[PDB]
From Swiss-Prot, chains A, B:
The lineage of its organism: Viruses, Duplodnaviria, Heunggongvirae, Uroviricota, Caudoviricetes. Transmembrane segments: none annotated. It comes from Bacillus phage phi29. Structural component of the 12 appendages that hang from the lower collar. Adhesion protein that binds to the host cell surface during virus attachment and mediates teichoic acids degradation. This is Pre-neck appendage protein. Autocleaved to produce the 74 kDa gp12* assembly attached to the phage particles. Autocleavage of the C-terminus is a posttrimerization event that is followed by an ATP-dependent release. It is found in: Virion. The N-terminus has three domains that function to attach the appendages to the phage, digest the cell wall teichoic acids, and bind irreversibly to the host. The C-terminus is an autochaperone that aids trimerization. The chain holds residues 327 to 691 of 854 of the full protein. Homotrimer. Each appendage is a homotrimer of gp12*.
Length: 365, 365
């Protein structure tokens, strides 16, 4: 029956409380069950608090948060409100109400310069007329992060987990929600930024499961950021807009939009490129394709090789097929050969050339 | 020396206990150390409990669970048994025994309409003659989830972590196990459903590490569900059977079996398709391939382009190679050109055509 159940803070012109541990608490009909803040250090244009740091809070219970008594000029209720603080770790939180009209804005807020906060093991039940279950707004700062995992929402929040502006680093994993009893539910998960890391969403009764910068995903989502590598035990450099998969050692994909699949000792520094099913191959131009090849090099714009060995395509839009030991240089040509160029399809001039013969009336027996 | 150490429940015709917090407990030689249930709400054909919700339980100790005394008609022992309840969050659980014959069925069970449960930070030691370490059976319900993470098993369970029927949403991460001292171990992890989310498995002494719907994985596994995106900071729509990787903005893979790699502003709505190493390209047919191309469109079944610019392949099995500025329409043709079609390999009729000349006796110097 208080305003704050546990408040951790400071007034302006004072240092905030720091290195505080909550090892279990029960808050019954408070306004803001857990309320961590530092007055004077919330505005985007204020200095960051140099003192608001380190809160570890666990096994937190919040029951029927409300403001029937009118505390703090009818401040809106919260199960949890974090602001200003760096390094808040919340584990095992249950918020429960039996009256949907008591709390109507946000059940859990992480906002107002709060940074590097982590929520894990959360059950929110009964808040069926609140706009937001969890609502996070960032600050927007280097080295920031917000981690939300293992959350389940039972008719709690038109937006179950909402991420607002100013947040570049978010991890949202294993969120589930029931929205059937909610007054006009919108989405289990919603994000303003286009690059959240997301996996393990499950819901019923929300019209949209995930809304990521305006795009809906209702059938499951896995999103990861940065350089990506899978089923490859070691590799050289991978650009943040690149990847290596299903490969053995010695591969690299060192520029924007370059990638290696199913290969050994193969490297691409070619912007817009793919190497697949190959060994000891290298793409160094742009728009390069190397497939099913051995010791193949593509080193000019749009150069490519398919089923080629010990060969180099160095022409503009120059493709080598089904070859061994040839180096080609022509523009808009498809070539094949064996130790020397033996045929050409010349797209530039409309010529077809064989080293030996060109014949019709053939059969294959 | 009790039947239940802590029991949280209700009898039939009563509401179950709700919003209960266990902030550390030690259970010594009980039958079921932690036993959460709601009689009358366990059968598949019973109503779901409307009251069994919210349990957060942490730092739980269970020692030598057994039924030497014969409680409850020789009910089988458990470190933890969850049934009926929604939203059970378990963090930091250690179960320990020095007598393998006391508990022989399942160490931890999540079954009988239990839903949206989460287990994290579990150590089970000494249960070397039990069939299952953790055994989960689902209900099978929309918006359900079971999350199991950071578990280590020391000679505990022929099946370390087993997922049974009725579970569509499972996350199993960071499970490790020693099976050397187990009486006939089978698998560290086992799954009935074909789509578990799994990563971070490590074992010794289990003949199989992971068995996923009957298929064994003994050398590491990472499985994710839904639309997939990596090393791409933003994108348009990705179908749940699609992906975008290593790409920049403006890409989409909007239908079953469509994908974009290493590209910019390129979109596929083509069922069974791939765009790689390309820009401003679009696949709209079926069985479409676009590689290393710029402003390329494939809009008919089996149409494809490789090393092509400002070109459209609109024929049935029509492939364009090494070209600029051509639109082709023929069936079973390979084409090349530069502002006009300049050559054709006609697989349908066995014709080869050049705009200019076709010659043999050529050399490339």
């Amino acid at each position: 029956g208080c305003y704050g159940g546990i408040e951790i803070k400071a007034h302006g012109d004072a240092p905030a409380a720091y290195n505080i541990s909550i090892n279990g608490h029960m808050s019954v009909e408070d306004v803001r069950s857990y309320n961590f803040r530092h007055i004077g250090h919330h505005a985007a244009t204020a200095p960051q608090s140099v003192s608001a740091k380190n809160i570890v809070a666990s096994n937190l219970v919040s029951i029927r948060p409300n403001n029937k008594r009118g505390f703090q000029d009818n401040a809106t209720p919260r199960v949890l409100a974090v602001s200003a603080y760096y390094g808040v770790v919340i584990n095992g939180l249950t918020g429960y109400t039996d009256d949907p009209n008591l709390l109507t804005e946000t059940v859990v807020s992480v906002q107002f310069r709060a940074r590097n906060c982590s929520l894990n093991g959360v059950v929110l039940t009964g808040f069926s007329n609140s706009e937001n279950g969890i609502y996070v707004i960032g600050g927007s700062r280097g080295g920031d992060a917000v981690n939300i995992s293992n959350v389940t929402l039972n008719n709690s929040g038109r937006y179950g987990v909402s991420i607002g502006s100013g947040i570049e680093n978010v991890s949202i994993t294993n969120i589930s929600g029931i929205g059937d009893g909610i007054n006009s539910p919108v989405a289990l998960v919603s994000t303003i930024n286009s690059n959240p890391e997301i996996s393990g969403l499950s819901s019923i009764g929300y019209p949209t499961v995930a809304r990521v910068a305006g795009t809906d995903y209702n059938d499951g989502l896995t999103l990861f950021n940065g350089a990506f590598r899978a089923s490859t035990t070691s590799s050289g450099k991978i650009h943040s807009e690149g990847f290596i998969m299903g490969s053995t050692s010695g591969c690299e994909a060192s520029v924007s939009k370059s990638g290696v699949l199913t290969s050994s000792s193969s490297k691409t520094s070619s912007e817009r490129s793919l190497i697949a099913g190959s060994s000891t191959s290298e793409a160094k131009g742009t728009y390069n394709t190397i497939l099913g090849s051995l010791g193949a090099v593509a080193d000019e714009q749009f150069a490519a090789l398919i089923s080629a060995s010990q060969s180099r395509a160095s022409g503009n839009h120059n493709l080598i097929l089904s070859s061994y030991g040839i180096n080609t240089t022509g523009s808009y040509k498809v070539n094949g050969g064996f130790e020397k160029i033996n045929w050409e399809l010349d797209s530039l001039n409309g010529r077809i050339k064989a080293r030996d013969t060109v014949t019709g009336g053939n059969t294959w027996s």
